[PDB]
Design an enzyme around this catalytic site. Sequence first.
Site, mmCIF file in Angstrom:
data_model
loop_
_atom_site.group_PDB
_atom_site.id
_atom_site.type_symbol
_atom_site.label_atom_id
_atom_site.label_comp_id
_atom_site.label_asym_id
_atom_site.label_seq_id
_atom_site.Cartn_x
_atom_site.Cartn_y
_atom_site.Cartn_z
ATOM 1 N N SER A 392 9.175 18.542 -19.675
ATOM 2 C CA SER A 392 9.557 19.801 -19.045
ATOM 3 C C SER A 392 8.410 20.251 -18.163
ATOM 4 O O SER A 392 7.318 20.547 -18.657
ATOM 5 C CB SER A 392 9.836 20.870 -20.103
ATOM 6 O OG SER A 392 10.818 20.429 -21.023
ATOM 7 N N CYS A 560 13.161 26.558 -26.273
ATOM 8 C CA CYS A 560 12.619 25.256 -25.936
ATOM 9 C C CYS A 560 11.809 24.696 -27.089
ATOM 10 O O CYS A 560 11.204 25.444 -27.854
ATOM 11 C CB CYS A 560 11.728 25.364 -24.691
ATOM 12 S SG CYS A 560 10.962 23.809 -24.158
ATOM 13 N N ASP A 605 16.482 23.674 -24.053
ATOM 14 C CA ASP A 605 15.688 22.578 -23.526
ATOM 15 C C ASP A 605 14.938 22.094 -24.746
ATOM 16 O O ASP A 605 13.745 22.366 -24.923
ATOM 17 C CB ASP A 605 14.707 23.022 -22.444
ATOM 18 C CG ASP A 605 13.811 21.877 -21.982
ATOM 19 O OD1 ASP A 605 14.252 20.714 -22.072
ATOM 20 O OD2 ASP A 605 12.677 22.129 -21.525
ATOM 21 N N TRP A 607 14.505 18.757 -27.784
ATOM 22 C CA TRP A 607 14.532 17.314 -27.931
ATOM 23 C C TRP A 607 13.987 16.961 -29.307
ATOM 24 O O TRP A 607 13.630 17.852 -30.081
ATOM 25 C CB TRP A 607 13.670 16.679 -26.836
ATOM 26 C CG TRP A 607 12.229 17.121 -26.874
ATOM 27 C CD1 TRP A 607 11.231 16.592 -27.641
ATOM 28 C CD2 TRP A 607 11.639 18.212 -26.144
ATOM 29 N NE1 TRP A 607 10.058 17.285 -27.437
ATOM 30 C CE2 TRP A 607 10.279 18.283 -26.525
ATOM 31 C CE3 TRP A 607 12.128 19.137 -25.209
ATOM 32 C CZ2 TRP A 607 9.398 19.241 -26.002
ATOM 33 C CZ3 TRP A 607 11.246 20.094 -24.688
ATOM 34 C CH2 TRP A 607 9.898 20.133 -25.088
HETATM 35 C C1 LIG Z 1 14.422 16.442 -21.858
HETATM 36 C C2 LIG Z 1 13.287 16.230 -22.635
HETATM 37 C C3 LIG Z 1 12.201 17.088 -22.511
HETATM 38 C C4 LIG Z 1 11.004 16.807 -23.160
HETATM 39 N N1 LIG Z 1 9.930 17.571 -22.925
HETATM 40 C C5 LIG Z 1 8.747 17.245 -23.464
HETATM 41 C C6 LIG Z 1 7.630 18.031 -23.208
HETATM 42 O O1 LIG Z 1 7.658 18.885 -22.324
HETATM 43 N N2 LIG Z 1 6.437 17.799 -23.902
HETATM 44 C C7 LIG Z 1 6.365 16.772 -24.851
HETATM 45 O O2 LIG Z 1 5.351 16.638 -25.534
HETATM 46 N N3 LIG Z 1 7.491 15.975 -25.092
HETATM 47 C C8 LIG Z 1 8.687 16.225 -24.408
HETATM 48 N N4 LIG Z 1 9.715 15.373 -24.525
HETATM 49 C C9 LIG Z 1 9.558 14.166 -25.370
HETATM 50 C C10 LIG Z 1 9.135 12.983 -24.495
HETATM 51 O O3 LIG Z 1 10.200 12.645 -23.603
HETATM 52 C C11 LIG Z 1 8.764 11.763 -25.339
HETATM 53 O O4 LIG Z 1 9.826 11.436 -26.237
HETATM 54 C C12 LIG Z 1 7.480 12.026 -26.131
HETATM 55 O O5 LIG Z 1 6.423 12.380 -25.237
HETATM 56 C C13 LIG Z 1 7.102 10.749 -26.884
HETATM 57 O O6 LIG Z 1 7.150 9.653 -25.967
HETATM 58 P P1 LIG Z 1 6.138 8.408 -26.093
HETATM 59 O O7 LIG Z 1 6.551 7.386 -25.106
HETATM 60 O O8 LIG Z 1 4.746 8.910 -26.046
HETATM 61 O O9 LIG Z 1 6.420 7.871 -27.584
HETATM 62 P P2 LIG Z 1 7.528 6.738 -27.867
HETATM 63 O O10 LIG Z 1 6.869 5.417 -27.785
HETATM 64 O O11 LIG Z 1 8.697 7.013 -27.005
HETATM 65 O O12 LIG Z 1 7.924 7.016 -29.403
HETATM 66 C C14 LIG Z 1 8.815 8.080 -29.746
HETATM 67 C C15 LIG Z 1 9.384 7.831 -31.144
HETATM 68 O O13 LIG Z 1 8.340 7.717 -32.120
HETATM 69 C C16 LIG Z 1 8.964 7.963 -33.392
HETATM 70 N N5 LIG Z 1 8.052 8.837 -34.162
HETATM 71 C C17 LIG Z 1 7.225 9.931 -33.615
HETATM 72 N N6 LIG Z 1 6.464 10.324 -34.818
HETATM 73 C C18 LIG Z 1 6.912 9.624 -35.858
HETATM 74 C C19 LIG Z 1 6.515 9.660 -37.127
HETATM 75 N N7 LIG Z 1 5.536 10.514 -37.410
HETATM 76 N N8 LIG Z 1 7.061 8.889 -38.077
HETATM 77 C C20 LIG Z 1 8.085 8.006 -37.719
HETATM 78 N N9 LIG Z 1 8.482 7.991 -36.377
HETATM 79 C C21 LIG Z 1 7.888 8.795 -35.482
HETATM 80 C C22 LIG Z 1 10.289 8.655 -33.098
HETATM 81 O O14 LIG Z 1 11.379 7.733 -33.247
HETATM 82 C C23 LIG Z 1 10.141 9.050 -31.640
HETATM 83 O O15 LIG Z 1 11.439 9.082 -31.030
HETATM 84 C C24 LIG Z 1 10.893 15.670 -23.956
HETATM 85 C C25 LIG Z 1 11.987 14.823 -24.094
HETATM 86 C C26 LIG Z 1 13.182 15.098 -23.436
HETATM 87 C C27 LIG Z 1 14.281 14.265 -23.619
#
Ligand SMILES: Cc1cc2nc3c(=O)[nH]c(=O)nc-3n(C[C@H](O)[C@H](O)[C@H](O)COP(=O)(O)OP(=O)(O)OC[C@H]3O[C@@H](n4cnc5c(N)ncnc54)[C@H](O)[C@@H]3O)c2cc1C
EC number: 1.6.2.4
Length: 608
Positions: A392, A560, A605, A607
């Site tokens: 966001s 949010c 908003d 997730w």
């Molecule tokens: C529309 C929208 C808005 C968003 N806005 C923001 C934002 O503004 N700020 C923000 O920080 N994020 C936001 N996100 C989340 C962001 O898109 C990512 O999902 C987040 O940053 C993690 O992505 P990554 O690639 O770093 O981790 P990834 O490699 O994508 O891993 C994510 C996955 O790790 C797993 N996981 C996380 N912790 C654990 C745990 N402790 N134990 C077991 N499994 C776990 C979950 O399955 C999670 O889905 C938003 C997501 C969407 C869809």
Amino acid sequence: PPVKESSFVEKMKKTGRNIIVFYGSQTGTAEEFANRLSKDAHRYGMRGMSADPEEYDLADLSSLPEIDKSLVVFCMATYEGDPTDNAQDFYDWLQETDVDLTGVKFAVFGLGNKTYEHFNAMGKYVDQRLEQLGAQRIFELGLGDDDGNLEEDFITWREQFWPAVCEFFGVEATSSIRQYELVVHEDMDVAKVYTGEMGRLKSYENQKPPFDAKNPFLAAVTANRKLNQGTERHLMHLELDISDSKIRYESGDHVAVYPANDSALVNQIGEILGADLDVIMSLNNLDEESNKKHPFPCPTTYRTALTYYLDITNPPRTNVLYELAQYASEPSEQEHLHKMASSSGEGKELYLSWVVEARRHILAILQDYPSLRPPIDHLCELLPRLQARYYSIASSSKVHPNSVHICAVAVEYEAKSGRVNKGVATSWLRAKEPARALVPMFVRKSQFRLPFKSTTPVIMVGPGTGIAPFMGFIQERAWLREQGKEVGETLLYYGCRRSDEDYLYREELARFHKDGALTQLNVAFSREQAHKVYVQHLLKRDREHLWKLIHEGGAHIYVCGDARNMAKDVQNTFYDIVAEFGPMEHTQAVDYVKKLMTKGRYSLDVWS
Ligand SMILES: Cc1cc2nc3c(=O)[nH]c(=O)nc-3n(C[C@H](O)[C@H](O)[C@H](O)COP(=O)(O)OP(=O)(O)OC[C@H]3O[C@@H](n4cnc5c(N)ncnc54)[C@H](O)[C@@H]3O)c2cc1C
Ligand SMILES: Cc1cc2nc3c(=O)[nH]c(=O)nc-3n(C[C@H](O)[C@H](O)[C@H](O)COP(=O)(O)O)c2cc1C
């Protein structure tokens, strides 16, 4: 305005296909299901193809009967009660058309999430709509829930789908098949080898607008600082330079980024497979008819695919493990991998806890099942595509037209698999330091917006990272006052663990409160005392006043952050507020609230 392909029916005819599976997907889930269903066709004497409904005119369904034993399946995911972007054309068409689909056979599998008001809305519609138009359902509507385990719901539906298909058409249950062929390139110009770009070759080097999902803009990181005070976790604030990109954005919009996997993790996968990641090659579709020439930008090196195009961190789906089984020389390990596809019993239970629950990524699986040594090229074919992550936008375009701000928590946790897992995008983002560190990105427009009337009251609820879009709102509302405009009450309900641990934008929020940009800065510190203090407790505290702004001030509500529990609890608190002051029964408070959502006065908003 995409240029549609020619009739899919005629393509089915020319290529001896009798089944076509369309995917409504946004994150590639429904797209995977479609391909698996399409591939399945072969194991039943049929032949199918997968297809993006956006590239075609679904009005040609009426021509599908011209093919003997024809059948169409729809794997449709839902997004905020709406169809995926690529399924919008189809949606609008279903509503307006009156075409007769007599003789058309179909089946639908929806990808939904129960902890939503509109669960599997799209799938429910397509399924009901095709029947109204006169088509005949060949198998019950599948209702997949990502709340529980979607992969499993799909297996169950699928396991029953084909037998039904076979029984109706009277076909027998007639085999490891590669989708692509490997072509090594001993020598060829470096100028034609993809190095991570997402679309046009050299599109990352030679940047030409407009920029989007296919042609991301590589924005320089001008700022990347730690937002939290303590060390329990790492929350960060980034500022991406979008000057000369011609990109337009507004607070409430999302910014997506194409990350790069951890290089050490990439190197280990190669090392454990005795493969040379630096080999240049291509995987060409063994079916020369398909427009999908490769699974990812080719030619390229294995290293590059594993780094920029492939998902090497999320738990492998059952079909991927099913195909790898053949490459496990140790009997018991080949057996375990083979049974991961089961719809019940120990195989399903093992997949659910040892792979999903423990969050074992491909590399972990290759280490815990040491006999598993598949050929790199076939692995790259099976792995799903690396997706962009959305954030966001934390800034206002009125104040920062040429810069996009991001507020994120770095993901890093102890997995039950025994290893420490790192979030792909956040690890990558965190490591970007202002030099020319660039980030491939694009903006996606949203409906999360400030009120048009600067005088309309604003109630923002965004604990933790939920504050992101609100920093943009506050900046914009502060800008409006500077601009001599008349601004209504601006109330923020924020929440964190401790003021001296992870109180995001503490200094900036204090400023806005001081200058009056924020009428109230209500902050719930969840851990500064024995009992929990949350934002909803503050809403309840100020219930009288909130009701006044809601029922008489026409205030807009914004929520949010976390969608699992926080959003629901906040929603429940608003129900109780309305119910008490209206007054009215709970049931009528729920209607009143949901109405605000349809009349654009209660926006989300969230997730997970
Ligand atoms: C529309 C929208 C808005 C968003 N806005 C923001 C934002 O503004 N700020 C923000 O920080 N994020 C936001 N996100 C989340 C962001 O898109 C990512 O999902 C987040 O940053 C993690 O992505 P990554 O690639 O770093 O981790 P990834 O490699 O994508 O891993 C994510 C996955 O790790 C797993 N996981 C996380 N912790 C654990 C745990 N402790 N134990 C077991 N499994 C776990 C979950 O399955 C999670 O889905 C938003 C997501 C969407 C869809
Ligand atoms: C921003 C966002 C909004 C969502 N909105 C809904 C929704 O309204 N209804 C629903 O049933 N599922 C919803 N989901 C869950 C998806 O339908 C589910 O995760 C689906 O598996 C995604 O498929 P895809 O990768 O093919 O798009 C949402 C997921 C995200 C990330």
